[PDB]
From Swiss-Prot, chain A:
Other information: Present with 3290 molecules/cell in log phase SD medium.
Protein function: Central component of the condensin complex, a complex required for conversion of interphase chromatin into mitotic-like condense chromosomes. The condensin complex probably introduces positive supercoils into relaxed DNA in the presence of type I topoisomerases and converts nicked DNA into positive knotted forms in the presence of type II topoisomerases.
Subunit structure: Forms a heterodimer with SMC4. Component of the condensin complex, which contains the SMC2 and SMC4 heterodimer, and three non SMC subunits that probably regulate the complex: BRN1, YCS4 and YCG1/YCS5.
Domain of life: Eukaryota
Cellular location(s): Nucleus; Cytoplasm; Chromosome
Assigned protein family: Belongs to the SMC family. SMC2 subfamily.
Gene: SMC2
Domain notes: The flexible SMC hinge domain, which separates the large intramolecular coiled coil regions, allows the heterodimerization with SMC4, forming a V-shaped heterodimer.
Protein name (database record): Structural maintenance of chromosomes protein 2
Domain SMC hinge: 71-189
From Swiss-Prot, chain B:
Purpose of the protein: Central component of the condensin complex, a complex required for conversion of interphase chromatin into mitotic-like condense chromosomes. The condensin complex probably introduces positive supercoils into relaxed DNA in the presence of type I topoisomerases and converts nicked DNA into positive knotted forms in the presence of type II topoisomerases.
Protein name, UniProt field: Structural maintenance of chromosomes protein 4
Homology family: Belongs to the SMC family. SMC4 subfamily.
Record remark: domains: The flexible SMC hinge domain, which separates the large intramolecular coiled coil regions, allows the heterodimerization with SMC2, forming a V-shaped heterodimer.
Subunit structure: Forms a heterodimer with SMC2. Component of the condensin complex, which contains the SMC2 and SMC4 heterodimer, and three non SMC subunits that probably regulate the complex: BRN1, YCS4 and YCG1/YCS5.
Included range, full protein: 557 to 948 of 1418
Length: 283, 386
């Protein structure tokens, strides 16, 4: 009768306004579990953040119209190592050395700005993508190195992954080292007439064709960095996964503010579905 | 004819009961209508009592909610203020983390040098090696005027200069077998043979090499292996000279900045290197550093706590969040029932008025009662005088 109709007319007026209680509920089910995954992940990572300190570049914006998309980051977080290749960390870490914490910027100017009007808390080296130059080890030399010691030599740039947008910074850091399984191999390659290249012993020693040989007592840094980089991306995901939901929920209130009238009227209308059904108890 | 006598009485005895009962029934129908007016007064009493029971709930709930509200808006202002104090604490914690790594890093760099050389000496004094010369930085003297510029342009002055490409390696092994330290070696043999002759310097700014007096010219090539056309500018005449003259250069600003041949541009904050050449140090102490690595642990944990106590603040406000609509539904159901009750009540207080008028009517009318009453005695006599 007029009981199940007055209600329905107001009930179907809520669907046209875009309000649904079973949705808004289902979202908070997610959001509550995404905020407590975010917190959980972070908490579980703080241990790691302690050992990976130099990965952070602090600068105050030099100028209001200074492009912040001209500072690419710290090297250490700008290239990743495939799992296959992990066994070369110690190598790659030595090959890079301190250049791991170099900052990569768009152009030499941006470097000079950062240095002077940027308030740098501690000393930083800055690789300016438009000024750097390094003679990269060629096809032929790598090809000769491979014949002199098969399956024991690799150009260090071939052991990592990075976006072409910063190629020159990686070319500068890695494009001129051969990683080698063992000192025997190093010696052999570096000091050889047609192949005069830097060589890094898998265990962390360096033969440089300039009267330089490292060595001596010492999983380390370059590994925790890779681990931290992973985790720090996993987090960016969630924060964005969450943010998507939140805005989807935060918006689902405007439709539930049209509840201020129609639900504020359907409540006393879904009332009389019984008020009349009571009287229909016969006499 | 002729009926007996025992049979003759039951003929009318029955007639009594066919009225003696018809009386009893008229008494029941009377006592039923009085029940209604008495069960209806019972219900109407229970409903009056239920309706007072709800008005007690509602007050309890309306108190609870209207209080939770005041606690929500108060618990928020605290979460907001506390989360702020957390980020500050986080900022400050990060600060100390940086300093801790520096202080530790540098005391380790020191301890390396003070450990290799102490052990490299002891090695050559047993005679177990020959051709160990020591730290190149103690193999040439320089004007104190440039003590910094050299120290921050050429950290290689901490290399070890030896002859045998193998005596370098003879040392490396000694260091492993006893875990003593790591070192770099300038190998004299394999070392390129350089033109140590005077260059023409752009802007007449000198070259670091020349300012150096080697103890023996048997080391004069090494010093050119580390420094080479490495100019000593000051207050940033460098970015003009270095970055592009005809020839690219590698210049150190006198106070300590560095532009390398590569394009590298290295500028500090508040530390510069000093003492790599002969020309109270800024050293830390394995207790001073121990004292910094001690308090960081505290500040690290006081963070771990303050983070937990804020987290729990967030979880608690979630609860309150998940109540303000639950209380408010219960408060709605009671008022919604209380109105439904007070509707059943006014419908019952009109059924009492009607069952009471049915009763009164049936008491103010004794017609059939007097009638059945006479016939009962009339037969009680007829039987009695037959």
């Amino acid at each position: 009768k007029q009981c199940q109709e007055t209600c329905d007319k107001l009930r179907a007026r809520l669907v046209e306004y875009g309000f649904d209680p079973s949705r808004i509920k289902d979202l908070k089910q997610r959001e509550d579990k995404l905020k407590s995954h975010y917190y959980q992940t972070c908490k579980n990572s703080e241990y790691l953040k302690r050992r990976v300190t130099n990965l952070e570049f602090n600068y105050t914006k030099p100028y209001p119209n200074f492009e912040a998309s001209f500072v690419h980051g710290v090297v250490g977080q700008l290239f990743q190592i495939d799992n296959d290749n992990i066994r070369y960390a110690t190598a790659l870490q030595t090959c890079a050395g301190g250049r791991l914490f170099n900052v990569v910027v768009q152009d030499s100017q941006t470097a000079t700005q950062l240095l002077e009007r940027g308030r740098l808390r501690k000393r930083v080296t800055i690789i300016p993508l438009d000024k750097i130059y390094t003679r990269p080890i060629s096809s032929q030399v790598l090809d000769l190195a491979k014949k002199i010691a098969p399956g024991k030599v690799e150009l260090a740039i071939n052991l990592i992954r990075f976006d072409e947008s910063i190629t020159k910074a990686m070319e500068f850091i890695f494009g001129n080292s051969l990683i080698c399984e063992d000192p025997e191999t190093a010696k052999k390659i570096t000091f050889h007439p047609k192949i005069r290249a830097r060589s890094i012993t898998l265990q962390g020693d360096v033969y440089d064709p300039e009267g330089t040989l490292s060595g001596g007592s010492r999983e380390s840094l370059l590994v925790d960095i890779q681990k931290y980089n992973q985790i720090q991306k996993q987090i960016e995901t969630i924060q964005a996964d969450l943010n998507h939901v939140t805005e989807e929920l935060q918006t689902q209130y405007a439709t539930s503010q049209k509840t201020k009238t129609i639900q504020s009227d359907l409540n006393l209308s879904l009332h009389k579905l019984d008020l009349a059904k009571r009287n229909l108890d016969a006499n | 004819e002729l009926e007996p006598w025992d049979l003759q009485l039951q003929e009318k005895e029955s007639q009594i009961q066919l009225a003696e009962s018809e009386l009893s029934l008229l008494e029941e129908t009377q006592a039923k209508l009085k029940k209604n007016v008495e069960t209806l007064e019972e219900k109407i009493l229970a409903k009056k009592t239920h309706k007072q029971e709800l008005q007690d709930l509602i007050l309890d709930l309306k108190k609870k909610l209207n209080s939770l509200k005041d606690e929500r808006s108060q618990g928020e202002k605290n979460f907001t203020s506390a989360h702020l104090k957390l980020k500050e604490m986080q900022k400050v914690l990060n600060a100390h983390r940086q300093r801790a790594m520096e202080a530790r890093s540098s005391l380790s760099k020191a301890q390396n040098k003070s450990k290799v050389l102490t052990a490299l000496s002891r090695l050559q004094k047993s005679g177990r090696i020959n051709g160990f010369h020591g730290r190149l930085g103690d193999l040439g003297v320089i004007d104190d005027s440039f003590d910094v510029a050299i120290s921050t342009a050429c950290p290689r002055l901490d290399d070890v200069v030896v002859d045998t490409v193998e005596c370098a390696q003879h040392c490396i092994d000694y260091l492993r077998k006893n875990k003593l330290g790591y070192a770099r070696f300038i190998l004299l043999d394999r070392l390129r043979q350089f033109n140590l002759q005077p260059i023409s310097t752009p802007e007449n700014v000198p070259r670091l090499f020349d300012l150096v007096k080697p103890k023996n010219p048997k080391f004069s090539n090494a010093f050119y292996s580390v420094l080479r056309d490495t100019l000593v500018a000051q207050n940033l005449k460098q970015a003009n000279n270095v970055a592009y003259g005809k020839k690219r250069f590698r210049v150190v600003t006198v106070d300590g900045k560095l532009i390398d041949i590569s394009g590298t541009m290295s500028g500090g904050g508040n530390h510069v290197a000093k003492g790599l050449m002969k020309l109270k140090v800024d050293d830390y102490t394995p207790e001073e550093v121990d004292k910094i690595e001690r308090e960081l642990s505290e500040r690290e944990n006081n963070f771990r706590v303050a983070s937990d106590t804020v987290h729990e603040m967030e979880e608690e406000l979630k609860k309150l969040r998940d109540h303000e609509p639950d209380l408010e539904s219960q408060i709605s159901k009671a008022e919604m029932e209380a109105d439904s009750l007070a509707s059943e009540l006014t419908l019952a207080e009109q059924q009492v008025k009607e069952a009471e008028m049915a009763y009164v009517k049936a008491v103010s009318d004794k017609a059939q009662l007097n009638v059945v009453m006479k016939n009962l005695e009339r037969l009680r006599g007829e039987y009695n005088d037959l």
